[PDB]
Coordinates of C-alpha atoms and ligand atoms in Angstrom, one line a residue:
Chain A
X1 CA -104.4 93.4 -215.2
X2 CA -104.1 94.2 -211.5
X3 CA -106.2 92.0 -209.2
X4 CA -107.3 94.0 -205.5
X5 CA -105.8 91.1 -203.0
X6 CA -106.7 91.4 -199.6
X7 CA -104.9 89.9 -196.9
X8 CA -106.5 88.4 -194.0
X9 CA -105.5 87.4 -190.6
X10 CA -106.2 84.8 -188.2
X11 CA -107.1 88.1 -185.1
X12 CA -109.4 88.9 -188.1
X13 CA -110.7 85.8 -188.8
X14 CA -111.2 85.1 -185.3
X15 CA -112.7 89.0 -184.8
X16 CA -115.2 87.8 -188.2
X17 CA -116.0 84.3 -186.8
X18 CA -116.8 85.7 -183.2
X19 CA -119.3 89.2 -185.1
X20 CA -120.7 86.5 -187.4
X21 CA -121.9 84.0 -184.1
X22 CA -122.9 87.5 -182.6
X23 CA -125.5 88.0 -185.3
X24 CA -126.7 84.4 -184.8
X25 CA -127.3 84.8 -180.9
X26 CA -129.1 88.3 -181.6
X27 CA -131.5 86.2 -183.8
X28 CA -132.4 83.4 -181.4
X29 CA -131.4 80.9 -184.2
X30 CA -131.2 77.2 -182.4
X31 CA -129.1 75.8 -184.4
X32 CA -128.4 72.1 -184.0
X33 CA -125.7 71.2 -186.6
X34 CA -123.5 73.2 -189.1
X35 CA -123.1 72.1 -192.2
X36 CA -119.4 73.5 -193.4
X37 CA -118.9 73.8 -197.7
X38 CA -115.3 72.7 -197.8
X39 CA -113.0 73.4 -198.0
X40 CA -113.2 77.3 -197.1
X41 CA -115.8 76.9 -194.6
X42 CA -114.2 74.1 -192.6
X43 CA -112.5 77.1 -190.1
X44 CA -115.4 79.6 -189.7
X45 CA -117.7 76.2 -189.1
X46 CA -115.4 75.4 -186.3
X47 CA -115.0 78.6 -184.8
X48 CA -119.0 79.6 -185.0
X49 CA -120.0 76.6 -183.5
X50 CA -117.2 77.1 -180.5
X51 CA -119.0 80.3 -179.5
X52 CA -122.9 79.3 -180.1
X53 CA -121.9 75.9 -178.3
X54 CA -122.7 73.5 -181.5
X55 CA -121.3 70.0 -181.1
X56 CA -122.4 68.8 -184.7
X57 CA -120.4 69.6 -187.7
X58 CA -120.7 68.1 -191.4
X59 CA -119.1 69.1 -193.9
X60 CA -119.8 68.7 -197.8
X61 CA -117.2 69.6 -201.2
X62 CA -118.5 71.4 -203.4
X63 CA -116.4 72.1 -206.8
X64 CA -116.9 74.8 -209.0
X65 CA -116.9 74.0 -213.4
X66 CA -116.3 76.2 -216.1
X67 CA -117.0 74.5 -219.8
X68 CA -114.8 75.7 -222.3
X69 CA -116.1 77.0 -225.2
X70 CA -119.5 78.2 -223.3
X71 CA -117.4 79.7 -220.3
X72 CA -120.8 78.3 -218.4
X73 CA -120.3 78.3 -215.1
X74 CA -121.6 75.1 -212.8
X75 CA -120.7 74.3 -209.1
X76 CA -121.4 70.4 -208.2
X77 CA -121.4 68.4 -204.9
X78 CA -118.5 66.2 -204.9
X79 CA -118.9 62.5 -203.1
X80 CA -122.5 63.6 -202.4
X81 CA -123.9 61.7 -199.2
X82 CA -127.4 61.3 -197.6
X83 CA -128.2 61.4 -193.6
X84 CA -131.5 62.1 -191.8
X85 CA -131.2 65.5 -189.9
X86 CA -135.2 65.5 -189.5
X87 CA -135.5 67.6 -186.1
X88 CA -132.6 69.4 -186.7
X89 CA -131.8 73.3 -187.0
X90 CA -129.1 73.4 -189.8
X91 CA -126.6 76.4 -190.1
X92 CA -124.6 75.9 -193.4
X93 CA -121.0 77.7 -193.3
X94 CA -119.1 79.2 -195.8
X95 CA -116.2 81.7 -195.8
X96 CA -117.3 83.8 -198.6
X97 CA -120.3 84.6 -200.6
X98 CA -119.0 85.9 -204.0
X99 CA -121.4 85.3 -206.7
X100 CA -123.7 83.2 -204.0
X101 CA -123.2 80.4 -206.7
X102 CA -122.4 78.3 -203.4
X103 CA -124.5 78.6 -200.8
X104 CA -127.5 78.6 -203.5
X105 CA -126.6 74.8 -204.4
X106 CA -125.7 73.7 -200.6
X107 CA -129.0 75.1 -199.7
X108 CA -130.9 73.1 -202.0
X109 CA -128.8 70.3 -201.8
X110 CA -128.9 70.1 -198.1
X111 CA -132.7 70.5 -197.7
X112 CA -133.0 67.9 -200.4
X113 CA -130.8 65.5 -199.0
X114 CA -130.6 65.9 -195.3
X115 CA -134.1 67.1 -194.9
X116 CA -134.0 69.2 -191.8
X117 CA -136.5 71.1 -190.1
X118 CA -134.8 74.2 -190.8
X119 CA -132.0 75.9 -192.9
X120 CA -129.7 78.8 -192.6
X121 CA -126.7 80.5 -194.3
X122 CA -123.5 82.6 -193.1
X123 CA -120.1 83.4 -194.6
X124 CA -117.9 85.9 -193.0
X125 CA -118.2 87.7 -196.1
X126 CA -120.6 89.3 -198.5
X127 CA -119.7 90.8 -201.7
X128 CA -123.0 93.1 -202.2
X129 CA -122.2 94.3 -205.7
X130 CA -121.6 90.3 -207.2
X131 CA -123.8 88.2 -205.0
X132 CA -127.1 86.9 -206.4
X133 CA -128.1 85.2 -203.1
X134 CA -127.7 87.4 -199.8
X135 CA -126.9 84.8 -197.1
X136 CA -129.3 85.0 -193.6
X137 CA -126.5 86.0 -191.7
X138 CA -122.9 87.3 -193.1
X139 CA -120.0 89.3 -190.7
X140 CA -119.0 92.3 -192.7
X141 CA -120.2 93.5 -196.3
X142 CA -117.9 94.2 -198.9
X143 CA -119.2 96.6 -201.4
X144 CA -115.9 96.5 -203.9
X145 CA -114.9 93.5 -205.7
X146 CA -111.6 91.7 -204.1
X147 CA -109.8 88.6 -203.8
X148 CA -109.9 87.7 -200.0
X149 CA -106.6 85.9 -199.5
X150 CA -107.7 83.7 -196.0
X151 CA -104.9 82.2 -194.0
X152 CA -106.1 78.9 -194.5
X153 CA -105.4 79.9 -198.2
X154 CA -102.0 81.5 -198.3
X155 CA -100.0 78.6 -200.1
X156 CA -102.6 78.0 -202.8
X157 CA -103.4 82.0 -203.1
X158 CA -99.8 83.3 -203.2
X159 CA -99.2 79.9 -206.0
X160 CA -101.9 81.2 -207.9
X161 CA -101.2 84.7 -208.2
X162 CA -97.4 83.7 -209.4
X163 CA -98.7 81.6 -211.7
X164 CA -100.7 84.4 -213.3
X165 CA -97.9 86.8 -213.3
X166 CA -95.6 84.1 -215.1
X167 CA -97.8 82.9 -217.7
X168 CA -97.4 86.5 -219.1
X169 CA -93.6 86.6 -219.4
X170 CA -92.1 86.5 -222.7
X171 CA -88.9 85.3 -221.7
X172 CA -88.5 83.0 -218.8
X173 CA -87.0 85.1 -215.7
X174 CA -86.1 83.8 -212.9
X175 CA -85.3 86.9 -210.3
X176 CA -87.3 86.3 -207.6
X177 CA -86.3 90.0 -207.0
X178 CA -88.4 90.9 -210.7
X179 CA -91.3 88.7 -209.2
X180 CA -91.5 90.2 -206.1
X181 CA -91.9 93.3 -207.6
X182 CA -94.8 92.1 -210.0
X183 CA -96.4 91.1 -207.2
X184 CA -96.5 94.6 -205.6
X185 CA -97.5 96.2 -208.9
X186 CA -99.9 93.5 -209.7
X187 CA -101.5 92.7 -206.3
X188 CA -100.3 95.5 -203.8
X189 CA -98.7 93.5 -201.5
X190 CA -94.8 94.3 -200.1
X191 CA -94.9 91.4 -197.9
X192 CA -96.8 87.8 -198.5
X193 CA -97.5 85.4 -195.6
X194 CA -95.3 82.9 -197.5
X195 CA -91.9 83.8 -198.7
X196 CA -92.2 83.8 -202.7
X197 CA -89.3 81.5 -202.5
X198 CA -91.0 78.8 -200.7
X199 CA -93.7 79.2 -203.3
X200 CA -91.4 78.7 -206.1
X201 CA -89.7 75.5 -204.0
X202 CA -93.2 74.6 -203.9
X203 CA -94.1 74.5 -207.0
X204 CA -91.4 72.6 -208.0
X205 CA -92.6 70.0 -205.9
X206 CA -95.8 69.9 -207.0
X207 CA -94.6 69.7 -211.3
X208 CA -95.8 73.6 -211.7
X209 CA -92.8 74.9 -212.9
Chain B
X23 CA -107.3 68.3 -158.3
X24 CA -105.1 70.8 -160.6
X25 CA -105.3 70.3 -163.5
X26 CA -102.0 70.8 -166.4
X27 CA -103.6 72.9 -168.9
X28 CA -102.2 74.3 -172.2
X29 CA -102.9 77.4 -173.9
X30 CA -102.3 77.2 -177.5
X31 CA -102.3 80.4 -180.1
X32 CA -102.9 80.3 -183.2
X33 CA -99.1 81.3 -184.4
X34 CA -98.9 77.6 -183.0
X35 CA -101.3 76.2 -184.7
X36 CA -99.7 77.5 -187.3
X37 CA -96.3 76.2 -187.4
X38 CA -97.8 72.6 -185.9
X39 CA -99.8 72.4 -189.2
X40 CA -97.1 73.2 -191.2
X41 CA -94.7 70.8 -189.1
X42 CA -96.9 68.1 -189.8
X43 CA -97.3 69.1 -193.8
X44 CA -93.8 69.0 -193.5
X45 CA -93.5 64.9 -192.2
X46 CA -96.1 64.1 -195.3
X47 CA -93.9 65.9 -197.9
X48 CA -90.9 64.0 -196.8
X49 CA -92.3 61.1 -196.6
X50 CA -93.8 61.4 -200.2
X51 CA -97.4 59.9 -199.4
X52 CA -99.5 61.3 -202.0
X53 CA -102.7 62.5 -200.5
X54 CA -105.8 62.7 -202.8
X55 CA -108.2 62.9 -200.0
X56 CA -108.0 64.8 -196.1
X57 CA -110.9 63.1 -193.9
X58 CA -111.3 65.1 -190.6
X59 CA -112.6 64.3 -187.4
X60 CA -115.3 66.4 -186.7
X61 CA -114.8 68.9 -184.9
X62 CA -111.5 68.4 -183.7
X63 CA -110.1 67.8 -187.0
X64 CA -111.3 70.7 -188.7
X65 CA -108.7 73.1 -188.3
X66 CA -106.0 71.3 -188.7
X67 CA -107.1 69.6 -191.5
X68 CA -108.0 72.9 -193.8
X69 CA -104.3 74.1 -193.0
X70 CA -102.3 70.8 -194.1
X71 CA -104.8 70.4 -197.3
X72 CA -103.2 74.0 -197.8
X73 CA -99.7 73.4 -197.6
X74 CA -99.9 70.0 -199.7
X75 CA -102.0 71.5 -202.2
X76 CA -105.2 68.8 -201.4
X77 CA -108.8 70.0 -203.1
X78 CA -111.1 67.1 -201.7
X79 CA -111.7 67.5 -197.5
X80 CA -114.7 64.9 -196.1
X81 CA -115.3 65.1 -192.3
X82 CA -117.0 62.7 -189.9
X83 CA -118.6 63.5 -186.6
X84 CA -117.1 61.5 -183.8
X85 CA -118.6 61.5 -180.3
X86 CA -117.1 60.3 -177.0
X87 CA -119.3 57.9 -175.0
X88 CA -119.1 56.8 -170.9
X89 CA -121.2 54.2 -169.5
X90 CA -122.0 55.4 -166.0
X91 CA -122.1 52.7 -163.6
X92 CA -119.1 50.5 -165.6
X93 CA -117.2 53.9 -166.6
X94 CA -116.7 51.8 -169.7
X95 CA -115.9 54.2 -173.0
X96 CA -117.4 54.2 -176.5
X97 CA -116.4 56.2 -179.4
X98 CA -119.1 56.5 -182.1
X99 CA -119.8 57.7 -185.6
X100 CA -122.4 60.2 -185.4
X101 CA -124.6 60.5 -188.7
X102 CA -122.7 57.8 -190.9
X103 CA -122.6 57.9 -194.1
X104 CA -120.4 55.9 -197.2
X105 CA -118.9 57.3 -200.6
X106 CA -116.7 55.9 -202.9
X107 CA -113.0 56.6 -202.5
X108 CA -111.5 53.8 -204.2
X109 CA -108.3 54.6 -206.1
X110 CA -107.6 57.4 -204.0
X111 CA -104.8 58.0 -201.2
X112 CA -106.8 59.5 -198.0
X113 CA -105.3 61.3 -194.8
X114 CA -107.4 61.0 -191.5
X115 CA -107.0 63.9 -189.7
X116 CA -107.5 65.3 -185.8
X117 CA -105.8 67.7 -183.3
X118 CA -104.5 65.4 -181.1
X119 CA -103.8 61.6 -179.8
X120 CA -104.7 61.1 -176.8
X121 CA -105.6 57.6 -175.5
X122 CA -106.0 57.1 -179.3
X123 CA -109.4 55.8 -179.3
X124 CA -111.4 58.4 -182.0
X125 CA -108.2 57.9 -184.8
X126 CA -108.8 54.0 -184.0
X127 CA -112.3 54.2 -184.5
X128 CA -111.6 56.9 -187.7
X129 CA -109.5 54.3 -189.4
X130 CA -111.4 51.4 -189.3
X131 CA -114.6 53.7 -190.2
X132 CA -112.7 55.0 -193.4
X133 CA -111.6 51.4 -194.5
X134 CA -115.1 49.9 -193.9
X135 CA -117.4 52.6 -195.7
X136 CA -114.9 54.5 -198.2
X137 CA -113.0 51.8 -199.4
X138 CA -109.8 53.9 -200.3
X139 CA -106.5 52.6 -202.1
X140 CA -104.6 53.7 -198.8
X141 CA -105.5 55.8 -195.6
X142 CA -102.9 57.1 -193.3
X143 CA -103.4 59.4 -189.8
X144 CA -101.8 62.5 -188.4
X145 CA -102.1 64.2 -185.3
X146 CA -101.2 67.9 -184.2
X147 CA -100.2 66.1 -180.7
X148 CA -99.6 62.7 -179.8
X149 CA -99.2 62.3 -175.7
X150 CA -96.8 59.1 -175.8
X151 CA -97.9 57.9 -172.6
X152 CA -101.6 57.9 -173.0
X153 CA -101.6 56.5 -176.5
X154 CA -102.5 53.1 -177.2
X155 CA -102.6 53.6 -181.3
X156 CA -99.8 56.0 -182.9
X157 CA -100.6 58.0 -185.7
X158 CA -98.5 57.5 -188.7
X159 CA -97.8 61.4 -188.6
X160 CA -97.9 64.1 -185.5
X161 CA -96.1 67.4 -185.6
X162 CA -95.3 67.5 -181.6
X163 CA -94.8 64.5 -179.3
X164 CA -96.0 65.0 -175.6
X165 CA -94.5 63.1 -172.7
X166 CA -96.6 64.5 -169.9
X167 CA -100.3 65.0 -169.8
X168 CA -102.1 67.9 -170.5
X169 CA -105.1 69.4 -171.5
X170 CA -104.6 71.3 -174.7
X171 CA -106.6 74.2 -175.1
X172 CA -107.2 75.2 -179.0
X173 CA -107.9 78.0 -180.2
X174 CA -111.2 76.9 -181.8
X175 CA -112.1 75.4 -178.5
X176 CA -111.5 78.7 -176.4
X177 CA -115.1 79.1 -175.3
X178 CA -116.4 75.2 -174.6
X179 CA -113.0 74.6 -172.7
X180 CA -113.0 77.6 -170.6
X181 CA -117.1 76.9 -169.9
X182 CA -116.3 73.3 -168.8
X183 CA -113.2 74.7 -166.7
X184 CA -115.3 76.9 -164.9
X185 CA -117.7 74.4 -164.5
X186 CA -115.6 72.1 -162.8
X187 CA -114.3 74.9 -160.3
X188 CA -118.2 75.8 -159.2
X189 CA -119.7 72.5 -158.7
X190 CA -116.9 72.3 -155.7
X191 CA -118.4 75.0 -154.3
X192 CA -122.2 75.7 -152.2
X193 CA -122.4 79.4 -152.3
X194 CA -124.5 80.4 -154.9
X195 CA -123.7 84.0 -155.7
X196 CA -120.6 83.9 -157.7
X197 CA -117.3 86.3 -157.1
X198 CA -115.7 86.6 -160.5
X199 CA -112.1 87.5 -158.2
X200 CA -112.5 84.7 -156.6
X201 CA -113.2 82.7 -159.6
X202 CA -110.1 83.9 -161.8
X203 CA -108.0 83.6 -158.3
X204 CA -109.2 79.3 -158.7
X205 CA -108.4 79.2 -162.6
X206 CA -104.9 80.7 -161.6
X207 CA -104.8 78.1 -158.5
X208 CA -106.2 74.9 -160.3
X209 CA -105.2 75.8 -164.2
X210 CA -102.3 78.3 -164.0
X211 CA -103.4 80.2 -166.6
X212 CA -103.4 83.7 -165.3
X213 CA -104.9 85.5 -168.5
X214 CA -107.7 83.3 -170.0
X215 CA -108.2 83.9 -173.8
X216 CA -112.0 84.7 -173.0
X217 CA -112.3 87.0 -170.1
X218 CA -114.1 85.1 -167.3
X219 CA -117.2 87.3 -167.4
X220 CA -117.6 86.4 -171.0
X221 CA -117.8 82.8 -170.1
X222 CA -120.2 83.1 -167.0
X223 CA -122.5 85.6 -169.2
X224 CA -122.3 83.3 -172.3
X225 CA -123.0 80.0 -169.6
X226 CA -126.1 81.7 -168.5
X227 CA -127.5 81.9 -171.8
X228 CA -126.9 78.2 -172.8
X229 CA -128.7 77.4 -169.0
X230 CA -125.6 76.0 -167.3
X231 CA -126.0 78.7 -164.1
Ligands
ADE27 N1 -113.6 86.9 -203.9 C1 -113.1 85.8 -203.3 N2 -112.1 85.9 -202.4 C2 -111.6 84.8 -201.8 N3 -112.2 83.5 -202.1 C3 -113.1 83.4 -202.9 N4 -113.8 82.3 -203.4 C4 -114.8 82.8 -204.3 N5 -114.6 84.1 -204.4 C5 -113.6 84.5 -203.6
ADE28 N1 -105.6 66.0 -173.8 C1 -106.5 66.7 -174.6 N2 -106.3 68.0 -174.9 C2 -107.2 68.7 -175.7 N3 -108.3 68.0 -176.3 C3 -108.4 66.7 -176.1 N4 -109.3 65.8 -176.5 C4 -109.0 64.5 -176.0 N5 -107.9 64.7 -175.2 C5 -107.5 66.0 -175.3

């Protein structure tokens, strides 16, 4: 019932991004345009192409499906698109490869669809014990199952993970003081980016609690 | 021949995108769908979709054209494409507002070729006496020119800025002290994010020296 959380920060995402273009330069990869999965590869896309010097950046949504009974698992391009990047050296960016579910359909979706000359994959991260796909390039290999909380994440994360923790309370409790401390026993962390009361406020907001 | 540059962190980048969440909560517009300008928009895009709690992030490529002999400008969709976003609220996104021209452009793209319910902009930055469109939403009003230097854009900006300082000069064989003794003259920035070297190595590699 406790879920390894790993915080991340922006000096490491930048640190990541910057190892990640490092990897790309070593390997006299041209690239031409970076196709980012959103939404978590919007940032590294960005920062990869600031540091190889890539002025072309798409972007496509790719959503992730679980069917109920089955618990099958299928990821799907959402508000799918066709353009012509014959000539092109494509670098498709993502922040993470988990399961590799991802970057397996973006690759075949994007050589499908956008029918470049050639095709590549990096993620800042590469969880070697789940991944089914290994990515051409990746920053730093992970070799223990986490969740990778990403800056660009911390709102949705940190409403998540309070979610799970009050879904399993038998009576309704509103001490933030009792959820702060679930959320060091449950997820090791003494000190989230956001305040759990702005989460809370937030929720409200949003009709989660 | 100075020129009024800005360093911004990422702590700012930060608290801008959260500023400008902020104006969007308040003023209750429902977002379904964040379109960013590419590349620009990236960034800031990923971080208010964050803080509102939006899944769906599109992006479109906008490049920045000059006719030589007129000096007449052109903004332009670079690799167009249309979807269907019809019943849905979108948000345009970009970093900044400067003249005003690419969230123009951005609008009238989005209404043409997505066909959404509604479509609003925001802006990081909006320099009040450059801009001939206002966004509907900016997190930081500027009254005095300046070139804002992202932290995504680190690299390309400090390669352009040195660019600009050799092509005043003949001799050939270049002093890195004199070099950062120009950037502190024409750019007052003292401590570049990139260390200078950094740059001129990385400009040799792309062939610009
Ligand atoms: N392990 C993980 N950490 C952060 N984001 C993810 N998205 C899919 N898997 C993830
Ligand atoms: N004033 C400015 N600062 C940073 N980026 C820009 N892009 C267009 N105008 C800009």
């Amino acid at each position: 019932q406790k879920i390894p959380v790993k915080v991340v920060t922006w000096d490491e995402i930048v640190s990541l991004s910057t190892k990640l273009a490092e990897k790309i330069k070593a390997d006299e990869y041209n690239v031409n345009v970076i196709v980012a999965i959103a939404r978590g590869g919007l940032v590294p896309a960005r920062l990869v192409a600031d540091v190889l010097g890539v002025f072309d950046i798409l972007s496509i949504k790719i959503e992730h499906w679980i069917e109920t009974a089955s618990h099958t698992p299928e990821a799907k391009v959402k508000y799918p698109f066709k353009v012509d990047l014959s000539d092109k050296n494509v670098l498709i960016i993502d922040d993470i490869t988990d399961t590799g579910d991802s970057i397996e359909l973006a690759r075949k979706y994007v050589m499908e669809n956008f029918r470049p000359t050639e095709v590549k994959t990096a993620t800042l991260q590469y969880i070697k014990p789940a991944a089914k796909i290994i990515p051409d390039y990746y920053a730093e290999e992970i070799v223990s199952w986490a969740w990778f909380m990403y800056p660009w994440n911390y709102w949705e994360d940190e409403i998540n993970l309070v979610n799970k923790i009050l879904i399993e309370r038998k009576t309704k409790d509103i001490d933030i003081n009792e959820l702060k401390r679930n959320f060091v026993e449950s997820y090791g962390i003494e000190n989230p980016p956001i305040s759990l009361d702005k989460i809370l406020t937030e929720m409200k907001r949003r009709k989660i609690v």
